[PDB]
Scaffold this active site. Structure first.
Site, PDB file in Angstrom:
ATOM      1  N   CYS A 119      25.571  37.067  23.082  1.00 35.65           N
ATOM      2  CA  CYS A 119      25.463  38.362  22.350  1.00 35.65           C
ATOM      3  C   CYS A 119      26.766  39.160  22.478  1.00 35.65           C
ATOM      4  CB  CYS A 119      24.168  39.063  22.697  1.00 35.65           C
ATOM      5  SG  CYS A 119      23.843  40.700  21.921  1.00 35.65           S
ATOM      6  N   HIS A 144      27.103  38.028  19.077  1.00 33.54           N
ATOM      7  CA  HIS A 144      26.287  38.760  18.117  1.00 33.54           C
ATOM      8  C   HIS A 144      27.185  39.104  16.904  1.00 33.54           C
ATOM      9  CE1 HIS A 144      23.784  41.833  16.335  1.00 33.54           C
ATOM     10  NE2 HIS A 144      22.792  41.271  17.017  1.00 33.54           N
TER      11      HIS A 144
END
Lengths: 187, 187
Positions: A105, A125
């Site tokens: 992420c 992400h």
């Protein structure tokens, strides 16, 4: 002998991206240490879940080395990882010994901060792409999990099971990963 | 006004099935209370993640009622829920007021123990089917998420995001669920 994982847990970490890898790796028979960046105290995650680490990072370092070092995401957690001299040292040592580093992420942006793994293919992400790509030190991927040798990255809460099973496969092999996967009821 | 969720956290709960719903529901703007069955103390989950509840169940009850009561799975956690008179009372009251009850993996077997929701379609983890079906009081489903009115069930760690988003949809609607889903990077 059992493989060992160090999961570094900072304030503001994404709790799903912390717990899913810890749990799946323990299902795989990996010995996992949840290490608190700030010390032994409970850690308030991004969505206010409070997790008690197994040990401080200081103590957990003394018990290494680890087969994998895992960096959860969450922007604030990743920034705390990026600002820590302790994390810099752990990651440099891991890279120097040719050990796996896994980050999800916003977590991969701590690799950038610590100058780890330059020249690798990475994902993050989507919202963390521009931060990760500052300077062009990595090549970006939109794969849900990316592995370029000893740098393993992934995108978000919804890729956490795939991320964790990729770590399991890298450490314990495809068959163990498949065996761990089936009881999870993944699609 | 914000919807409210009660998540009942017992020793041996599946930590993924606890954290994923808490986190996703908070992303949806639901006010979530993580309530410790045993008291205020930290809870050792099935794969040894330790979570500090927001409140004891005793205290959290006083602050109800809730728009949803959520039962994580994990066999030992589900058995602790099934053995608790406090949980029986909470679930009976929730059913009596026509409020949503949501349970995942082995969690639905606490509905059986407490005689909740008989005559509903339900799913469980595959390994918990026979326990859930003792007596034929429910109709079994292999859907990844099952919702029969006010009884919402799901199967395992790998269905936890779908379970949590089904709760979000039931409380806050389809559009909020879709908005919360997109940043998760689900497949």
């Amino acid at each position: 002998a059992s493989k060992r994982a160090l999961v570094i847990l900072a304030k503001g970490a994404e709790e799903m991206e912390t717990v899913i890898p810890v749990d799946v790796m323990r299902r795989a028979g990996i010995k996992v240490t949840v290490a608190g960046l700030a010390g032994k105290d409970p850690v308030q995650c991004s969505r206010d879940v409070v997790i008690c680490p197994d040990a401080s990072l200081e103590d957990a370092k003394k018990e290494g080395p680890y087969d994998v070092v895992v960096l959860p995401g969450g922007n604030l957690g990743a920034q705390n990882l990026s600002e820590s001299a302790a994390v810099k040292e752990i990651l440099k040592e891991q890279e120097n010994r040719k050990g796996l580093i896994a980050a999800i992420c916003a977590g991969p942006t701590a690799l950038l901060a610590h100058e780890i793994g330059f020249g690798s293919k990475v994902t993050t992400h989507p919202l963390a792409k521009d931060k990760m790509m500052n300077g062009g030190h990595y090549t970006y991927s939109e794969n849900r999990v990316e592995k370029d040798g000893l740098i393993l990255t992934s995108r978000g809460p919804g890729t956490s099971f795939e991320f964790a099973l990729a770590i399991v496969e890298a450490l314990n092999g495809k068959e163990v990963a498949a065996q761990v996967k089936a009881p999870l009821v993944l699609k």
